Design an enzyme around this catalytic site. Sequence first.
Site, short mmCIF file in Angstrom:
data_model
loop_
_atom_site.label_atom_id
_atom_site.label_comp_id
_atom_site.label_asym_id
_atom_site.label_seq_id
_atom_site.Cartn_x
_atom_site.Cartn_y
_atom_site.Cartn_z
N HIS A 188 -4.15 8.52 8.34
CA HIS A 188 -3.35 8.33 7.16
C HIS A 188 -2.69 9.68 6.71
CE1 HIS A 188 -3.01 7.48 2.62
NE2 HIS A 188 -2.02 6.81 3.18
N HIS A 217 2.54 3.89 8.91
CA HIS A 217 1.93 4.08 7.57
C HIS A 217 1.49 2.77 6.94
CE1 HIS A 217 1.80 4.64 3.06
NE2 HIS A 217 1.01 5.62 3.45
N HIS A 250 1.88 11.00 6.11
CA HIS A 250 2.21 11.90 4.98
C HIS A 250 2.55 13.35 5.37
CE1 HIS A 250 0.92 9.25 1.46
NE2 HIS A 250 0.27 8.63 2.43
FE FE2 Z 1 -0.20 6.64 2.03
#
Ligand code: FE2
EC number: 1.13.11.58
Length: 849
Positions: free
Chosen positions: A510, A701, A515
């Site tokens: 993640h 994502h 990100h």
């Molecule tokens: Fe996220």
Amino acid sequence: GHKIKGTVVLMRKNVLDVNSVTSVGGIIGQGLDLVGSTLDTLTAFLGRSVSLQLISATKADANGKGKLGKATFLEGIITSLPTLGAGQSAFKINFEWDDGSGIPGAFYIKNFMQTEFFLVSLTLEDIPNHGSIHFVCNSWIYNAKLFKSDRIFFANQTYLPSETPAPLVKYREEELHNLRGDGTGERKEWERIYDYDVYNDLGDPDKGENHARPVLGGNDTFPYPRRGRTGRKPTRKDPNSESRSNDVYLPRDEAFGHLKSSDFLTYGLKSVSQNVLPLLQSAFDLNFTPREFDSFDEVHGLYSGGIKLPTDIISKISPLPVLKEIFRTDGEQALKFPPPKVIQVSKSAWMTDEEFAREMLAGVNPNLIRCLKDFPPRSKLDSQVYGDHTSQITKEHLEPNLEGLTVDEAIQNKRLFLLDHHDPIMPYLRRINATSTKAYATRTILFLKNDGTLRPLAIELSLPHPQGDQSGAFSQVFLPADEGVESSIWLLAKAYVVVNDSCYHQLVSHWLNTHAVVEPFIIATNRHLSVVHPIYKLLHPHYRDTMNINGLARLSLVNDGGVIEQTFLWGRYSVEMSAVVYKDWVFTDQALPADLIKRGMAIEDPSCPHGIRLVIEDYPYTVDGLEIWDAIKTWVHEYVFLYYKSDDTLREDPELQACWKELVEVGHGDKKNEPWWPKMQTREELVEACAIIIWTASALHAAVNFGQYPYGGLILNRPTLSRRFMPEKGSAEYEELRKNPQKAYLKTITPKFQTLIDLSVIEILSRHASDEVYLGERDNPNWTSDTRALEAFKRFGNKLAQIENKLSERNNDEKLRNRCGPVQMPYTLLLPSSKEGLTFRGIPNSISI
Ligand SMILES: [Fe+2]
């Protein structure tokens, strides 16, 4: 002359700001939808408040630049337009222009009005023998004094950086220069300056030594992607660390407002860290709840009656903006949680080996499993003899009741699979186990049954060195058991695996892989590709709100005292361990087919639908992701080939070439010498690079993010930390495991307080805002006047809608057991569309949460 007729659509700050909009929050896009008349501050915009000045695309002045018209002020309110829409306000403005000034292609705007506003668009009409010209703006316009050089906006038209219209060439370049910003200075709220810095702002060395955290990036030990430069003053105790602040800058226009309070999700996260956590921690440093769960039933009561708090603790969380829409309450003592989808049909089906194995294909972290090529398995660690001398799973550990193949025949026939969590945690384990946490480095081996399901066969719990560091792994291996204390032992063994897996998922699958790694692409794009460039417009929707949620992560999630450090296994080493894992990150391996091949989960095969053949057919993440990957790739190929006539044309493009060079050499600059970076000498390389970016930002994502509460909102199914070692032999804890195994499980995993933190955060993370913009052919307005691109974007969405039907169909196929499991939870995580809320579906364009 002539009068050119302008329509300006803007939004007022009060309609989009969290502080104002807290009194506006149930079923939005609405409320006699703000036409701009009766609450009415609309008169303020009218006199000598806002000036617009058109810039010719076709007629230049003495020194090359497009001719400026007269600065013109907004002359009237338009009360209604068929296309108006909620929160918007429209204004008529008429411009003096002649034949001889040519065709406008840009405009400057000045706001003299003190309060900033959000400019949506300009439409110009009544230009002789020419169609309407549209300007899509979507930008906050601050007071004109603040600026030095006016805000400029370009028309609808996409142009390659031959920079097209000669009078506009210098305007295009100067705004790109204004966006880069120089590299010095503390960044301020109203600024639109994009630049890079390392992750030196997570620790707090002025608070002490135990609050310092290593600089990530710009060194060989901890390489990292760059993040958005915020140029605060450095810390007192360390010149190389940036001082902390409650407000972190991101370039304005990267922070999105919302019409609905309850859609302000990052604000809800920030509240959970700042307001809710210290309050709830006060109740445990108090009394009013027991600090520990005593039964599984006590965990289930979280979604029934909830957990009892006193009135004044629960009255300080009941009226906070956003969180009162995402927390429940029964009167005034119960904080309650929505039942996670994992237990909605069966309370106990998560405990099953079948479900444990199925979540490696269709769960929150469906990306890690690999096909076992050789045997036993091996480590990539340098020179200790578990690495130099492998895992301690033997061939006689693996003969249960199913086949009776040899280990060698199962490997031959691609039937053995590995979940390897041994290496990242191993060098840190001694430090980790010297704290309150107690953890193992784990490996699990899985066998594909004849029914197409996976089952775990062996779990290796490894420790580092009873004496030493050299001489390798102290390992124990555990085997499935149906009954007695051995099953309870086996369940705890699975818990030690899931604890490794949860933490890897959080920090790497993640945080790192979506990100962190996407942020330098956002920065490189804005610094080097004009808003007018075809590739800017392709990539732009996929960046929405990402620098925002990342800036909040630095402040509240991944920082020195923050949520992740307090909740997950790796503790204070969490972020630096993900920098170690970043050593092995390769850009082109993030492409879905490349990933599948690398892990041995697919092979090359031209006769198969997407050009690869799947070892494991019922792998829901992969089979669904492959449809979406192909829809993205086809879209990006059609788009790219609309604009670049040849490979030379791409080699000639100075904006694209500069973009990519700065991406490679600065943004992912610790990997600048790696040979696998695409050069950008071929249209095919641009297709692949863009396909990877959009995949990452959108479906990768989504897949890794939106199942977090549905699967892990029961802490029993996804524990985040472990705090006891395995009960051995004739212990008093072994006997406790015999008489009360629920309490032994509960004492091993995440304690009650950290459970409440984990659930509150992942409930927010797993939610779609009501104004989310999905892959599902969606954009904001009318981004280009090129009809060939609009038609191609149309085909992209018709393909997506057809893929959604194919996937729904697969969920109803009785043969495909891994799509549902004993837990009867249809895999909808890669369905492109979604409605809003705690939905286990929906692919946003961007990393937005
Ligand atoms: Fe996220």
